Design a protein around this ligand. Structure first.
Ligand SMILES: [Mg+2]
Ligand SMILES: [Mg+2]
Ligand SMILES: [Mg+2]
Ligand SMILES: [Mg+2]
Ligand SMILES: [Mg+2]
Ligand SMILES: [Mg+2]
Ligand SMILES: [Mg+2]
Ligand SMILES: [Mg+2]
Ligand SMILES: [Mg+2]
Ligand SMILES: [Mg+2]
Ligand SMILES: [Mg+2]
Ligand SMILES: [Mg+2]
Ligand SMILES: [Mg+2]
Ligand SMILES: [Zn+2]
Lengths: 140, 193, 39, 135, 103, 77, 64
RNA sequence: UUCCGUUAACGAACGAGACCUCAGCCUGCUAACUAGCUAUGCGGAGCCAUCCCUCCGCAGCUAGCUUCUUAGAGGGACUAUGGCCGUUUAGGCCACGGAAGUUUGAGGCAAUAACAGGUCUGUCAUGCCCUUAGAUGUUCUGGGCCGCACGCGCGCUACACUGAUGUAUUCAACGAGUAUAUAGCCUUGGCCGACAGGCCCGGGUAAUCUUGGGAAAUUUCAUCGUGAUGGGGAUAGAUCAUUGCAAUUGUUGGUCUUCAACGAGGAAUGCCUAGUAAGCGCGAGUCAUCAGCUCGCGUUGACUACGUCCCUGCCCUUUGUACACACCG
């Protein structure tokens, strides 16, 4: 019955990682995870996988659909979607205390593979063209 | 410290030794907490005082590459420069490029400076010590600016201007922008003691 | 050839949403129409 | 198939395929055009016309219902106006329309009901066969 | 016999509109009708920014007026008289009802 | 470094960089880059950026390609 | 010939200087863990930080 | 001026706070074919290929469907718990936990007293004065507000390689569509056209169509090579097309050509403390046409500081005054 739909978020990038009990598949909107297209920010998407292991994923397959955000925000998003989706699957289907090991792998590395950033675009206010910046002042 | 995790998936963090125990506390390199695959993390540093001492150092170097307006925030470009830079360092030195940078941080950070303090009721610049964290902050600042200035209106690439800068600085030769700026600060501060 | 429906002024006019009010007569009638200044 | 292969290196393969896949017609305005209002010079590459085809033969493969007024956007870009601020600029449709015309005559794409341009049953085959022919 | 009759509700008022909305739903649930609602629609927010001054002097200060508009939809599988037999309760002040016969 | 102004001076295509010099210019630190050679030799680029391929087809060195036209060089082995 | 000597900030006293730009601290010499002298540090500095000192005889006064 | 308290005061009123709005958490609730996963039916392809495995399109009584979206309800944080500090009071610093510990973030509202502050050119709001038919009334034609020795302010574009150009690749959010006349404001798709722009069939008074707004910087791959260069794009010549009743003192958008100053800017001086500065583009106002502007939006995303009263100012107390249109005395 292994099926979990766990999400991850960054600024506006929302990723939803539906799962089935398969062999090794990880596909983002159908395209392989090995191909996402910041090729500098590729380890960030790969970061959960090299943290836990390809072995930990030996009986699951991943289809991680993304929408919104930008380029960098999405890679930080898929990171949580992969990382969170694993423990939710482990919580529901493997063991509750076999995921305590998994979590402390993710948490001792980076705390933001499970919990998002609340940071957002502060609104613009008048008297200037930024959140804080104000129009230049002249006296004479 | 334990963990076989490597930057860009090529360079080991074990076998880097930071000599001067003064700023061993703020080189976020040696402990296994600081190892990271990429010098790009959107960590909420600057949120509290001394928190940016916890930012991995190769990121702190990276953050400073984005200056003068037409580079602000272009961090993928900045990190890509870092990768090519360490390619060149190991290319030219065949040692641990992590060691080179942290030795380039340690040799090019001024230990003293002159500040306008006032004793007895009259102010003037007087000689003072420098805290380790501003010293690291200053060591980064000198290197990145020196690499920046040379690359400008030069066919040479920034990645390699940075690379010459770090190699010369880690050696300690009087050849880097960072080294000459460091020693002029000390000499002034020494005079106004 | 477009004036305020309230005063007949030719300047500062708000055609947006079809109010056809000047920027001042609108402000005078803004809450009555139902534009709440929430923020 | 198409998604397991690099959307760049693959299109090099498919750009080398519409050369040697027999041939087709080719405009007597091909080598002058800048492909957009905002471009500075015409495309540098001589065999750009098939690369534009190969790049745009995946568009219909990976989408459906794209007209010419949308294909213009897909290849448009920033426009620097000198003194005044730069904006977005929509590219030209003569190039985009004609690429469709050629691949229509060749059985990779067809005109689409409900509006647009839709991929062929058997054109899907080669875009998946040549896809298999990439490392 | 059993049609597709859609009731559309708009208003400037959150509380007031859900008074009517729920009453219609509980109106027809007491008749065990096929009541498919409420589908809740993105709130429209009309906006005007105007300069506070009548003379363009002083620190230029702007006030953002706005209006929330809320959009509600109910489906009833019923007749043109069963819809009207229900929708005769007191419509609260200002709430807009525009029932039409869908496809 | 008039090293696109020098790309046709007959010394170049005769021998200048066909090991006439570029044995050495990597050997300063033994594999010094394609661009360090590009300025540790006072001559710059694009007589070099053509030969960055030329020595590669001649099988004397191994090379890279990437974003900023970063390109690399190796001596021997 | 001065020899660079290391000390540790045991404690922090105030923020002296006209603009406040100088944190005044008490330092602990590592060669002799007995010499508690005042020094004037620039930059953010807490207890447990280690200051590199070129000279040592230069001693800060109270509220210097 | 918020409290603990003090106390010739006692008890109250405003302001502050509370409050109100968007953002940050809710696999819990109400749901939802104008939002949408998930499964299954088929259909297309690849391929150990026959099935299975993968990507895809189309419909349903598929859901013990609502994770993702919308919008309602309410839940949640109170410095709650722990530690040190402190009249051990009010409160301070920190730490595990947590979405969140600067009142969590940002805004709205916002006292008394005043200023001879601005606005009679927003208002058939308005006292007094001026004119009132040969008009300072109205209406029409044309010109001017745009003129150019010069000084000033907000800005746009740059002075390049952390780049220009030409490929390929592809990720948002906020808003917007007045019978708009015989398609018409936003405009999909078809065709003509090198660009510009046309002709055609249409969709939408809109989570339904435009548009899930396929945004740019960015990311790749080449070409250029320290040269006022292919940086930069002022100036000007020729022509074409659109808006409008009309384009001249070029409305604007094209094409070719012309290729200026500018080599990081003296004395001075502005804004700014985390999704912030800075970079990038988008929408809305005006609008027939014109956005180098303003109001909003999202995208990439730091350096530095966690302080002081030194300069500029503000609040309270004490003190001096020959000041009271108040030290610009
Ligand atoms: Mg350079
Ligand atoms: Mg720009
Ligand atoms: Mg507040
Ligand atoms: Mg008035
Ligand atoms: Mg004017
Ligand atoms: Mg202004
Ligand atoms: Mg140019
Ligand atoms: Mg480009
Ligand atoms: Mg506009
Ligand atoms: Mg402060
Ligand atoms: Mg006196
Ligand atoms: Mg007097
Ligand atoms: Mg005087
Ligand atoms: Zn009016």
């Amino acid at each position: 019955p292994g099926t979990v739909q766990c999400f991850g978020r960054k600024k506006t990038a929302v990723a939803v990682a539906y799962c089935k009990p398969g062999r090794g598949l990880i596909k983002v909107n159908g395209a392989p995870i090995e191909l996402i297209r910041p090729e500098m920010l590729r380890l960030k998407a790969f970061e959960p996988i090299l943290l836990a292991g390809r072995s930990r994923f030996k009986d699951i397959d991943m289809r991680i659909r993304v929408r919104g955000g930008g380029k960098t925000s999405q890679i930080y998003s898929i990171r949580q979607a992969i990382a969170k989706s694993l423990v939710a699957y482990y919580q529901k289907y493997v063991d509750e205390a076999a995921k305590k090991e998994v979590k402390e792998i993710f948490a001792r590395y980076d705390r933001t593979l499970l919990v998002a950033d609340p940071r957002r675009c502060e609104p613009k206010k008048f008297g200037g063209r930024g959140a804080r910046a104000r129009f230049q002042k002249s006296y004479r | 410290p334990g963990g076989d995790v490597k930057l860009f998936n090529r360079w080991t963090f074990e076998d880097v030794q930071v000599s001067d125990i003064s700023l061993n506390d703020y080189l976020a390199v040696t402990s296994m907490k600081h190892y990271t695959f990429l010098p790009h993390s959107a960590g909420r540093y600057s949120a509290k005082r001394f928190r940016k001492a916890q930012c991995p150092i190769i990121e702190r170097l990276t953050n400073s590459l984005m200056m003068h307006g037409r580079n602000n925030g272009k961090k993928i470009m900045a990190v890509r420069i870092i990768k090519h830079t360490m390619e060149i360092i190991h290319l030219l030195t065949d040692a641990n490029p992590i060691q080179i940078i942290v030795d380039a941080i340690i040799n090019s950070g001024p230990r003293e400076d002159a500040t306008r303090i006032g004793s007895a009721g009259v102010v003037r610049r007087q000689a003072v010590d420098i805290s380790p964290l501003r010293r690291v902050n200053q060591a980064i600042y000198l290197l990145t600016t020196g690499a920046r200035e040379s690359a400008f209106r030069n066919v040479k690439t920034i990645a390699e201007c940075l690379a010459d800068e770090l190699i010369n600085a880690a050696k300690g030769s009087s050849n880097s922008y960072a080294i000459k700026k460091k020693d002029e600060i000390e000499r002034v501060a020494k005079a106004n003691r | 050839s477009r004036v305020c429906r309230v005063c007949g002024n030719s300047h500062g006019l708000i055609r947006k949403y079809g109010l056809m009010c000047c920027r001042q007569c609108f402000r005078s009638n803004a809450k009555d129409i139902g534009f709440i200044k929430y923020r | 198939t198409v998604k397991d292969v690099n959307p760049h290196e693959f299109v090099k393969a498919y750009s080398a395929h519409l050369k040697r896949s027999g041939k087709m017609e080719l405009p007597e305005w091909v080598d002058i055009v800048k492909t957009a209002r905002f471009k500075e010079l015409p495309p540098s590459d001589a065999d750009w016309y098939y690369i534009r085809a190969a790049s745009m033969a995946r568009k219909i493969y990976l989408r459906q219902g794209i007209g010419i007024g949308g294909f213009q956007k897909i290849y448009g870009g920033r426009q620097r106006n000198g003194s005044r601020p730069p904006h977005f600029c929509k590219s030209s449709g003569a190039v985009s329309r004609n690429i469709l015309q050629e691949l229509q005559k060749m059985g990779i794409i067809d005109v689409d009901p409900k509006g647009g341009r839709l991929i062929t049953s058997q054109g899907r085959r080669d875009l998946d066969q040549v896809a298999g022919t990439v490392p | 016999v059993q049609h597709r009759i859609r009731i559309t509700l708009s208003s400037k008022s959150v509380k007031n509109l859900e008074k009517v909305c729920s009453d219609l739903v509980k109106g027809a649930k007491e008749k065990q009708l096929k009541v498919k609602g409420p589908v809740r629609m993105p709130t429209k927010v009309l906006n005007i920014t105007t300069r506070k001054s009548p003379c363009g002097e002083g620190t230029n200060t702007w006030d953002r007026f706005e209006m929330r508009v809320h959009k509600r939809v109910i489906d009833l599988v019923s007749s043109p008289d069963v819809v009207k037999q229900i929708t005769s309760i007191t419509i609260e002040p200002g709430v807009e009802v525009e029932v039409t016969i869908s496809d | 470094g008039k090293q696109k102004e020098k790309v046709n001076n007959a010394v170049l295509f005769d021998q200048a960089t066909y090991d006439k010099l570029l044995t050495e210019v990597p050997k300063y630190k033994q594999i010094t880059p394609s661009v360090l050679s590009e300025r540790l030799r006072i001559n710059g680029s694009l007589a070099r950026r053509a030969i960055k391929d030329l020595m590669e087809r001649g099988l004397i060195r191994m090379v890279s390609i990437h974003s900023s036209q970063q390109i690399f060089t190796r001596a021997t082995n | 010939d001065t020899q660079v000597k290391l000390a540790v900030v045991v404690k922090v006293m105030g923020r002296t200087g006209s603009r406040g730009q100088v944190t005044q601290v008490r330092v602990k010499f590592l060669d002799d863990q007995n010499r508690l002298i005042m020094r004037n540090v620039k930059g953010p500095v807490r207890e447990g930080d280690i200051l590199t000192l070129l000279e040592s005889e230069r001693e800060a006064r109270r509220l210097r």
